[PDB]
Design an enzyme around this catalytic site. Structure first.
Site, PDB file in Angstrom:
ATOM      1  N   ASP B  10       0.806  -1.192   0.000  1.00 37.13           N
ATOM      2  CA  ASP B  10       0.000   0.000   0.000  1.00 37.13           C
ATOM      3  C   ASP B  10       0.852   1.261   0.000  1.00 37.13           C
ATOM      4  O   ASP B  10       1.966   1.280   0.534  1.00 37.13           O
ATOM      5  CB  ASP B  10      -0.910  -0.041   1.241  1.00 37.13           C
ATOM      6  CG  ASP B  10      -2.050   0.998   1.270  1.00 37.13           C
ATOM      7  OD1 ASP B  10      -2.416   1.637   0.219  1.00 37.13           O
ATOM      8  OD2 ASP B  10      -2.639   1.160   2.395  1.00 37.13           O
ATOM      9  N   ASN B  12       0.918   3.577  -2.985  1.00 38.73           N
ATOM     10  CA  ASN B  12       1.447   4.094  -4.291  1.00 38.73           C
ATOM     11  C   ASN B  12       0.739   5.460  -4.564  1.00 38.73           C
ATOM     12  O   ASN B  12       1.389   6.438  -5.005  1.00 38.73           O
ATOM     13  CB  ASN B  12       1.114   3.134  -5.455  1.00 38.73           C
ATOM     14  CG  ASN B  12       1.961   1.885  -5.436  1.00 38.73           C
ATOM     15  OD1 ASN B  12       2.918   1.819  -4.702  1.00 38.73           O
ATOM     16  ND2 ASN B  12       1.558   0.844  -6.171  1.00 38.73           N
ATOM     17  N   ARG B  14      -0.689   7.613  -2.405  1.00 38.42           N
ATOM     18  CA  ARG B  14      -0.268   8.589  -1.423  1.00 38.42           C
ATOM     19  C   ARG B  14       1.134   9.087  -1.757  1.00 38.42           C
ATOM     20  O   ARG B  14       1.449  10.286  -1.665  1.00 38.42           O
ATOM     21  CB  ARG B  14      -0.364   7.980  -0.033  1.00 38.42           C
ATOM     22  CG  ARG B  14       0.356   8.699   1.051  1.00 38.42           C
ATOM     23  CD  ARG B  14      -0.286   8.333   2.444  1.00 38.42           C
ATOM     24  NE  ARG B  14      -1.628   7.742   2.244  1.00 38.42           N
ATOM     25  CZ  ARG B  14      -2.656   7.815   3.108  1.00 38.42           C
ATOM     26  NH1 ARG B  14      -2.536   8.453   4.277  1.00 38.42           N
ATOM     27  NH2 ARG B  14      -3.821   7.238   2.794  1.00 38.42           N
ATOM     28  N   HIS B  27       1.947   4.417  -9.629  1.00 40.81           N
ATOM     29  CA  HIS B  27       1.898   3.001 -10.141  1.00 40.81           C
ATOM     30  C   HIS B  27       3.274   2.569 -10.672  1.00 40.81           C
ATOM     31  O   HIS B  27       3.747   1.401 -10.425  1.00 40.81           O
ATOM     32  CB  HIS B  27       0.854   2.794 -11.253  1.00 40.81           C
ATOM     33  CG  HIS B  27      -0.547   2.946 -10.761  1.00 40.81           C
ATOM     34  ND1 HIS B  27      -1.536   3.596 -11.491  1.00 40.81           N
ATOM     35  CD2 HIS B  27      -1.123   2.558  -9.596  1.00 40.81           C
ATOM     36  CE1 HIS B  27      -2.661   3.592 -10.790  1.00 40.81           C
ATOM     37  NE2 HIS B  27      -2.438   2.959  -9.645  1.00 40.81           N
ATOM     38  N   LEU B 121      12.850 -18.849  -6.316  1.00 42.03           N
ATOM     39  CA  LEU B 121      11.778 -18.206  -5.518  1.00 42.03           C
ATOM     40  C   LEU B 121      10.417 -18.507  -6.201  1.00 42.03           C
ATOM     41  O   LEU B 121      10.304 -18.426  -7.426  1.00 42.03           O
ATOM     42  CB  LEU B 121      12.012 -16.688  -5.665  1.00 42.03           C
ATOM     43  CG  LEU B 121      10.907 -15.773  -5.065  1.00 42.03           C
ATOM     44  CD1 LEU B 121      10.945 -15.775  -3.497  1.00 42.03           C
ATOM     45  CD2 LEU B 121      11.211 -14.289  -5.474  1.00 42.03           C
ATOM     46  N   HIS B 183      -3.031  -0.269   9.762  1.00 39.09           N
ATOM     47  CA  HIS B 183      -2.792  -1.431  10.592  1.00 39.09           C
ATOM     48  C   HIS B 183      -3.933  -2.455  10.460  1.00 39.09           C
ATOM     49  O   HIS B 183      -4.623  -2.727  11.417  1.00 39.09           O
ATOM     50  CB  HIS B 183      -2.605  -1.008  12.069  1.00 39.09           C
ATOM     51  CG  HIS B 183      -1.355  -0.162  12.275  1.00 39.09           C
ATOM     52  ND1 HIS B 183      -1.060   0.484  13.455  1.00 39.09           N
ATOM     53  CD2 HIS B 183      -0.366   0.159  11.415  1.00 39.09           C
ATOM     54  CE1 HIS B 183       0.103   1.129  13.331  1.00 39.09           C
ATOM     55  NE2 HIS B 183       0.516   0.989  12.089  1.00 39.09           N
ATOM     56  N   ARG B 184      -4.088  -2.993   9.266  1.00 37.49           N
ATOM     57  CA  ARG B 184      -5.187  -3.917   8.970  1.00 37.49           C
ATOM     58  C   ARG B 184      -4.751  -4.928   7.956  1.00 37.49           C
ATOM     59  O   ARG B 184      -3.835  -4.645   7.183  1.00 37.49           O
ATOM     60  CB  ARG B 184      -6.384  -3.138   8.342  1.00 37.49           C
ATOM     61  CG  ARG B 184      -6.862  -2.018   9.248  1.00 37.49           C
ATOM     62  CD  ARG B 184      -8.186  -1.409   8.803  1.00 37.49           C
ATOM     63  NE  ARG B 184      -8.432  -0.428   9.891  1.00 37.49           N
ATOM     64  CZ  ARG B 184      -9.492   0.357   9.979  1.00 37.49           C
ATOM     65  NH1 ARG B 184     -10.393   0.361   8.997  1.00 37.49           N
ATOM     66  NH2 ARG B 184      -9.601   1.205  11.019  1.00 37.49           N
ATOM     67  N   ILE B 185      -5.446  -6.053   7.883  1.00 30.29           N
ATOM     68  CA  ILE B 185      -5.189  -7.068   6.823  1.00 30.29           C
ATOM     69  C   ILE B 185      -5.940  -6.771   5.551  1.00 30.29           C
ATOM     70  O   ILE B 185      -5.546  -7.205   4.509  1.00 30.29           O
ATOM     71  CB  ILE B 185      -5.605  -8.521   7.396  1.00 30.29           C
ATOM     72  CG1 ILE B 185      -4.842  -8.774   8.666  1.00 30.29           C
ATOM     73  CG2 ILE B 185      -5.478  -9.627   6.223  1.00 30.29           C
ATOM     74  CD1 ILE B 185      -3.358  -8.725   8.479  1.00 30.29           C
ATOM     75  N   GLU B 197       3.987 -13.630  11.698  1.00 27.16           N
ATOM     76  CA  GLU B 197       4.384 -12.352  12.306  1.00 27.16           C
ATOM     77  C   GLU B 197       3.776 -11.273  11.435  1.00 27.16           C
ATOM     78  O   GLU B 197       3.803 -11.367  10.208  1.00 27.16           O
ATOM     79  CB  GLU B 197       5.904 -12.214  12.295  1.00 27.16           C
ATOM     80  CG  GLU B 197       6.457 -10.913  12.872  1.00 27.16           C
ATOM     81  CD  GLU B 197       6.454 -10.865  14.439  1.00 27.16           C
ATOM     82  OE1 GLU B 197       6.270 -11.922  15.151  1.00 27.16           O
ATOM     83  OE2 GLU B 197       6.653  -9.689  14.865  1.00 27.16           O
TER      84      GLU B 197
END
Lengths: 211, 223
Positions: B10, B12, B14, B27, B121, B183-185, B197
């Protein structure tokens, strides 16, 4: 709606062992101080217009009968969430009677997690849907998020707005999962027995300011 | 041992606004930040990196508009596939791509098949993804098995549902990082984050660099 904006707060109550150790006391004293902090948080939530408080004791109960008359006198509606099927039929009855006694209360709804896991909760809801499928009542393609929502614990209460975890770890530890998709997560290093009304006020004002 | 890191990317929009630039500039800088984070994870032996294409500014938008933006995001990755493949990266798109245009769905299937044999990866890009949607897609599968008579309701357990949700073949998610200060999922991974974590930083996604990623890996090593 109260000014802080918070209808349902959930708390992972961690830090009782570490609180006792700091004092050179055994873990049991921490758990007693933790019980005192639960009463204090319950009272604070009942007095600050919170609809629901959901508590998870994280290990890092027979008190029920000892606290239930006090809850009832504070107009608290008590509910236990979790897999209580493997408690003996007698403990299940004393849990059921405590729920029945306070079910008409109009104050805070207090949910206590007992043998609860967020994965377990989703799976139990999935089993209720699967039973409806197997009875021929429900088509799989009718199953959507709102339908599964209506089968998980606490679906009839306000969504959880704020999760507080005390004790310094920054993890959900398989407490609520489906229900915290949009919740504010607030982590504090304060240990659970020290977490008081000013700390609760701080978390609610943080929710108000960040929402 | 952080084996699988997931990131809510999160900030981009702002970021572009702080730079005095239009959304598109943020972007583009976000996409540079993706290349840098993938490189860092591949250089540091992370097994799996799961990136959630996300902006909090999208909270107040209709599903079809959001999906349209997610098709653009995924199109932009098409030109990066040849280099990922050379770098032994296995690429997967997770999320609801069912109503993407058919040519883009075919390209996604081609890029996944090209890289599926790679042993470096694993990079999951979560596009038009939601954690609730992911669970429900897995529930719908089990419900079909019940309807067909191949499964009893009381046989459904955590292991079984686990096998029907995204990423069940990869190492468990160890660490979720969210940049941009919320502070959220926000309905990223839910089932898969039970024991991860959670690391929140105010750094905006386009500014999140190798030092920031190492800081998060330190949070995890301490805890």
């Amino acid at each position: 709606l109260p000014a802080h904006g918070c209808r349902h707060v959930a708390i992972i109550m961690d830090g009782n062992g570490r609180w006792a150790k700091k004092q050179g006391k055994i873990r049991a004293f921490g758990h007693k101080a933790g019980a005192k902090s639960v009463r204090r948080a319950v009272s604070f939530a009942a007095n600050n217009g919170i609809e629901a408080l959901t508590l998870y004791a994280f290990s890092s109960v027979w008190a029920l009968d000892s606290e239930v008359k006090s809850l009832h006198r504070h107009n608290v509606r008590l509910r236990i969430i979790g897999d209580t099927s493997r408690f003996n039929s007698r403990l299940q009855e004393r849990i059921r009677k405590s729920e029945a006694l306070t079910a008409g209360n109009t104050g805070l709804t207090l949910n206590i997690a007992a043998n609860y896991g967020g994965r377990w909760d989703i799976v139990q809801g999935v089993r209720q849907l699967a039973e409806k499928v197997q009875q021929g009542n429900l088509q799989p393609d009718q199953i959507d998020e709102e339908m599964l929502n209506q089968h998980v614990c606490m679906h009839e209460l306000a969504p959880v707005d704020l999760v507080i975890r005390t004790g310094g770890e920054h993890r959900i530890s398989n407490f609520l999962l489906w229900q915290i998709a949009y919740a504010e997560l607030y982590f504090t290093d304060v240990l659970w027995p020290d977490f008081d009304e000013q700390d609760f006020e701080g978390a609610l004002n943080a929710f108000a300011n960040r929402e």
